[PDB]
Amino acid sequence: PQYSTFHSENRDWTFNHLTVHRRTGAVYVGAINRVYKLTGNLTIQVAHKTGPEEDNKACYPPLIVQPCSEVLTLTNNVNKLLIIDYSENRLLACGSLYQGVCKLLRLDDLFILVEPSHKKEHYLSSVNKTGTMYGVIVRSEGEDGKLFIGTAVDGKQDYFPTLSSRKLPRDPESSAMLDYELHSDFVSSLIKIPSDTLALVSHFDIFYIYGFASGGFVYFLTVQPETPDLFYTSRIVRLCKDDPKFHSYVSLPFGCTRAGVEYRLLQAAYLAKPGEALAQAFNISSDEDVLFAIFSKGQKQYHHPPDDSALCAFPIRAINLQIKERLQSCYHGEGNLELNWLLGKDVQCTKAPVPIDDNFCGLDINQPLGGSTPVEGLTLYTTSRDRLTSVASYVYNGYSVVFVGTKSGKLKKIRADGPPHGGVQYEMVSVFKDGSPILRDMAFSINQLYLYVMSERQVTRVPVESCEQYTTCGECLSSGDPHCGWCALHNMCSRRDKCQRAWEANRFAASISQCMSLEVHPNSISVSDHSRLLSLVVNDAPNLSEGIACAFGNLTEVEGQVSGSQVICISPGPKDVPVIPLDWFGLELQLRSKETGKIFVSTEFKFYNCSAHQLCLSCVNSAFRCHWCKYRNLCTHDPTTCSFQEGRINVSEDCP
Ligand SMILES: *[C@@H]1O[C@H](CO)[C@@H](O)[C@H](O)[C@H]1NC(C)=O
Ligand SMILES: *[C@@H]1O[C@H](CO)[C@@H](O)[C@H](O)[C@H]1NC(C)=O
Ligand SMILES: *[C@@H]1O[C@H](CO)[C@@H](O)[C@H](O)[C@H]1NC(C)=O
Ligand SMILES: *[C@@H]1O[C@H](CO)[C@@H](O)[C@H](O)[C@H]1NC(C)=O
Ligand SMILES: *[C@@H]1O[C@H](CO)[C@@H](O)[C@H](O)[C@H]1NC(C)=O
Ligand SMILES: [Cl-]
Ligand SMILES: [Cl-]
Ligand code: NA
């Protein structure tokens, strides 16, 4: 029962992030003091060292720019960001060490290509806590490359922008590597947290949980304290892929609701395709993007979110639409921009006869833009105690399958259907024996047979499917597991492509109705009536012509005669018939395929003892075919053994 696994070199060097190379299958783990490159089965190939190093967070600029007067401590370098830059066959890794500098590593050997560190913005943030920074690389065909990066700033609002866009030139040795995409006094590709907002509210900060590119936009999902107990707000922040001025900035709350509970604290997210049921539920094409998200109940307890948590789905289209409607109503002069932490105050929308296209990327007016009314997601599934902590999803055979990690190291497999049910958990695996919470980063092997999952101490490769755990066609085809069918002749629950000869008639059942059944006649015989010929019919069967054998429980196995779906077998002989405990005795009559060697169907077969009854009424009312011999004064299965034909009694009505 043991999956492939990789452990941290040390109990304090916890794992942070994880990514799999879509083309190579190479596995990259971002950890404290280490960046690891691993094989598919999690065999380490390269261990790139990133720490520890003597440092102090008070040291700004960093030690690599300036000598520091502060006392230094050997400091752990937390992986804050880990992203594959596919176009350029390299990996971007940014730690917490030295105010959050970054490295570019070559994919094959993790040899350092460059480490930008002369410019102020080359330092992303001194924050040493995971789950607070996220990046997205965007490189079209005619562009050298771009990096969007959002991060908590820890109150150092003048040191670090909370969101920005940087140059990711193709050439590693470019002097402009990681420079602001645009940098001027009052127009830059960056957002800074106003000093007045930290003054008003501390410890005000903005946490970037997830980010993604979809269509012509980038999206960041954030949590931050609300501004005039502490209440937090989870938001969708959108920008156009092509907008140095950051004029396209817009920000809406989001979350979801079910059964009298509001889930507003964002925990995790993952962009995927809908699957057929959600596509219909959402009225979108099956290859449009859907955001799968985990939220905890309420808007409080950010550092220790309630156990009560939910898996929700947001179609990107529904998001863009609610954003467009917001833009439109603002450019009609309705209401305010409503983004107090940034604008600092109430700013009124400006009416202007500008057409708001699907791909409107902002102007000078009416930006940045907030809003109060939340984007509501579709709640798929909820839990009450084993708090959900991560999420990944993909589509198998038109079914959206969602994997959800829990705080106790469990992995749930949810099958997504639209309303009215939403989602159905069809399995839960125990992944980490130590009960360690599952971290946010999960990723599939290149052909989606496995899902890589991590705790702070461990990376584990978990099979997407374990169909063989279902041992009857009934269990298999009612599990609700999209991967699982019944391999008829091998008596096995498996993937179609794992079932030999699946393409041949009735070899593979995809539906409970396609499960074989077995009819026997007669379905019961007198114990004294041995060596009977029985007629077995196999419903919904495949070719049996290779050969069939009949097994009478443990007692017997004889070669059957096969004609289509009909089998004829000889019942056990005198020595082999079972003895009855004092009226009958049941057992499973089974067919073994000679082609495969496996028992694949069964049904009950009963032996009875008419002699067991010693009174006419008892004999006659037997569940089995018994006859009372009036004169011989006994019960029998064979009426021709009564003394006279006149002695035969079959019904109780004429019992003496
Ligand atoms: C699996 O494990 C062995 C251990 O050395 C390794 O050689 C092999 O490359 C691994 N297979 C993969 C995932 O490529
Ligand atoms: C983050 O900073 C705090 C400051 O007190 C420190 O205690 C903690 O160990 C740090 N986490 C790291 C460097 O792993
Ligand atoms: C999606 O849903 C709406 C409402 O049912 C429908 O009018 C529309 O035609 C559907 N798809 C298209 C073509 O936009
Ligand atoms: C067959 O079944 C009987 C009980 O029904 C058992 O006592 C016997 O050991 C079994 N024979 C085997 C397993 O070969
Ligand atoms: C039928 O029942 C009688 C007892 O009523 C018993 O003596 C006889 O052995 C039974 N036949 C069996 C169990 O084979
Ligand atoms: Cl808290
Ligand atoms: Cl179900
Ligand atoms: Na069939």
Instruction: Tell which one of 529, 576, 583, 609 to mutate to probe ligand 5, the residue whose CB is within 8 A of the most ligand atoms.
Output: 609
Q: Half-sphere exposure of residue 630, counting CA atoms within 13 Å on the CB side?
A: 12
Instruction: Tell which one of 38, 41, 459 to mutate to probe ligand 1, the residue whose CB is within 8 A of the most ligand atoms.
Output: 41
Q: Which domains does the chain have, with CATH numbers?
A: 1-476 (2.130.10.10), 477-656 (no CATH)
Distance 587 CA to ligand 4 centre (A): 12
Stretch (H or E) spanning 474: helix 473-476
Residue 268 and residue 294 in contact, taking contact as beta carbons nearer than 8 Å: yes
Contact residues of ligand 5, CB 6 A cut-off: 527, 579-580, 582, 609, 611-612
The span from the first CA to the last CA of the chain, in angstroms, equals: 66
- Give the CA distances from residue 594 to residues 340, 416, 544, 558, in Å, rounded to whole numbers and listed in that order: 76, 40, 8, 12
126 lines ligand 2 (CB under 6 A): no
- Could you tell me where the beta strands, DSSP code E, fall in 417-545? 423-430, 443-444, 450-454, 458-463, 485-487, 492-494, 508-509, 517-521, 524-526, 533-539
- Reported resolution in A? 2.3
SS3 label, residue 46: strand
- Nearest atom, ligand 2, residue 77 CA: 13
Ligand nearest to the CA of 541: 8
- Nearest atom, ligand 1, residue 25 CA: 13
The torsion angles phi and psi of 615, rounded to 5 degrees, stand at -135, 145
Q: Which residues on adjacent β-strands are paired with residue 238?
A: 219, 250
User: Quick count: other Cβ atoms within 10 Å of Cβ 75?
Assistant: 19
43 lines ligand 1 (CB under 6 A): yes
Ligand nearest to the CA of 554: 4
Ligand 5, atom 13, lies closest to the CA of 580
- Nearest atom, ligand 1, residue 42 CA: 13
Residue 62 and residue 77 in contact, taking contact as beta carbons nearer than 8 Å: no
Ligand nearest to the CA of 585: 5
Stretch (H or E) spanning 279: helix 276-282
Rg of the chain over CA atoms, in angstroms? 35
39 lines ligand 1 (CB under 6 A): yes
Distance 555 CA to ligand 4 centre (A): 8
Q: Which residues of 139-153 are buried (b: 16+ CB within 10 A; e: fewer)?
A: beeeeebbbbbbbbb
The DSSP letter of residue 369 is: B
List, in sequence order, the alpha helices (H) in 307-459.
Answer: 316-330, 340-343
| Percent of residues in the chain assigned helix, strand, coil, to nearest 5 | 10, 40, 50
Residues ≥6 apart with Cβ < 8 Å to 428: 410, 411, 412, 413
SS3 label, residue 451: strand
Residue 459 and residue 39 in contact, taking contact as beta carbons nearer than 8 Å: no
Distance 96 CA to ligand 2 centre (A): 10
Strands 548-552 and 508-509: what pairing? unpaired
16 lines ligand 2 (CB under 6 A): no
- Nearest atom, ligand 2, residue 76 CA: 13
Ligand 1, atom 9, lies closest to the CA of 39
**CA 50, 51, 54: angle at the middle one, nearest 5?**
140
Residues ≥6 apart with Cβ < 8 Å to 274: 282, 284, 286, 288, 290, 313, 315, 395, 400
- Nearest atom, ligand 2, residue 78 CA: 14
Tokens of 462: 């978990």
